[PDB]
Amino acid sequence: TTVLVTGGAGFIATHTDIELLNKGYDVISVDNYGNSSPVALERVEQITGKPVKRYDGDVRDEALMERVFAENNIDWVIHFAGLKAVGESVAKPIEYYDNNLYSTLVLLKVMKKHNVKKIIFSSSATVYGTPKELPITEETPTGGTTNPYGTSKLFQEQILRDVHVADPSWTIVLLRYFNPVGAHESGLLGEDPKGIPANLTPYVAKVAVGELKEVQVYGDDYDTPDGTGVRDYIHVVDLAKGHVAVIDHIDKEGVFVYNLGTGHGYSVLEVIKAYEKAAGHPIPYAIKPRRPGDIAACYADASKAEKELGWKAELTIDDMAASSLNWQTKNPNGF
């Protein structure tokens, strides 16, 4: 089984690459390195002892994607390529909608042309907007998205559903990830964005090892116990294993929806404390205004994925923090 992984050198993709390779799948990456390094793929290869076929370019480049599909026999696609910062998406909607919607459309056009009809889409808890209920299940209504990133994810889900309506020989798996954190136990690979991290834990990790000065905590006036945002953090290795479970167990036509989270919700301050326990010292933070697009609280009921895929997130917020900190200590500037 050959798996094309778009955004193949990113955070979640590189952890997924490892887990796929370790189970005997073949892996091809396509990435433009907007938010990652090609070096991450060397580290995948080093950890696993296995190849990643590497293509360099944009998923919106039809000629490139035609070459990828012409040169390889692809069974599954995992579509990670996208821009993903909630706050940034509010200020740059067109950049988000172009990148995120059109990457998907060029991918699907080329897939259809080669009759490759099995896709895992990297969706997001953001599709639930302000959650109609907590914890969130796959029956919780979607919509009321609060930022163009989240909107783009919900739009993409609908586009994929419409593909199956027009051709029900497709297998479409919509994986709504919560908040992945952490690093591969080896410490050879972890979260390495370009520029200042837009997400919480890489920023916290960098402050803890002295690469950044101060954790910026966006809002303390949310309707949560300590007033900061509450999120379901999941170890990126558990999230990676979920992808392998999908491909191991789903070999039928249809549209399948799964929440991938832990069910445990942590506030921003509780994440900071987890890292402080891991580091053995204070991690400086400051309360700042709310970030546009942010909601108060979201966390998952992931029991559907356990039932149908045999999959559960085992790793704890301490494992997440320790592994993150191990990676960032060994690689303070990343790659």
Next chain:
Amino acid sequence: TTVLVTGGAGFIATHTDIELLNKGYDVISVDNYGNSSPVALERVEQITGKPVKRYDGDVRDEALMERVFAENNIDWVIHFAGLKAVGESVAKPIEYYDNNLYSTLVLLKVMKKHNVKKIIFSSSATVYGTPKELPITEETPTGGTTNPYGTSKLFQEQILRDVHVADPSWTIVLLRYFNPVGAHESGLLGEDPKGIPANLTPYVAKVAVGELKEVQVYGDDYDTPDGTGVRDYIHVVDLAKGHVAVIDHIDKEGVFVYNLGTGHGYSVLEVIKAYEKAAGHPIPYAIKPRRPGDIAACYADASKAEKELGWKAELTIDDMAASSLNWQTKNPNGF
């Protein structure tokens, strides 16, 4: 004032071109002729005695759209370019989403680059899905769209709203048209799709003049008085005049939403009868299965547009039928 009209040689656009030109606006067309003829623009020029600057190509071609904006000083854009058949959209979702979403995104990218920040978007009663109430007002909730075409229109509206959030110096006018029918009184111009018409009235007109054999009536088991679909038909000349009213009266920043319809609902059989009265003979029809994506009944409350734009649709279903039939009699194969 210079107005770029994308999809500038299509049905609604050519009627709009006339009304804009007759009020002293300058008009540029960009069109790929997927569903229209370049000859329609000669007829615009002939009716008005005024020029249309003609560009030939795809709105998704960034280099073309960059040339259009570099070569002209554009004040307003009216974005008609899209694929628009409900039933077809169900079978060809990706063609619809590519054409419709990416045309809009390339347009907006180029507009932003030249600081042209006034747009009228050709939206659609389809955004209301199965209407939560009748008649439909701009307060009726959107969503529950039943076909990728309608979905694409609702997605585009949200994208445009997100542009204004990121840059509230924009003027965005979302015009939700109901069902335009008819032709310019001259009979020199009218609805001329490529291939068999996908919409009702051009097909009815062609049957009436003997160009097609039999009106295919899609479903007679809807919850409507005669069981066929019910739509708010609006004379295309009234709809064109609505666009001029927007540009005459709206010169401020913001997002503005208007339903453009008559408030009168007609069944498919009542449309056929209107044409039979206009032709003076039976127009053969046959009851066929439901078309995928179709809803039972939609019609407009357009009083918001009357209030704010001084605009109202005056022309009746008889005017629509007579003018359609006048055009199709003089031009049985169109252009």
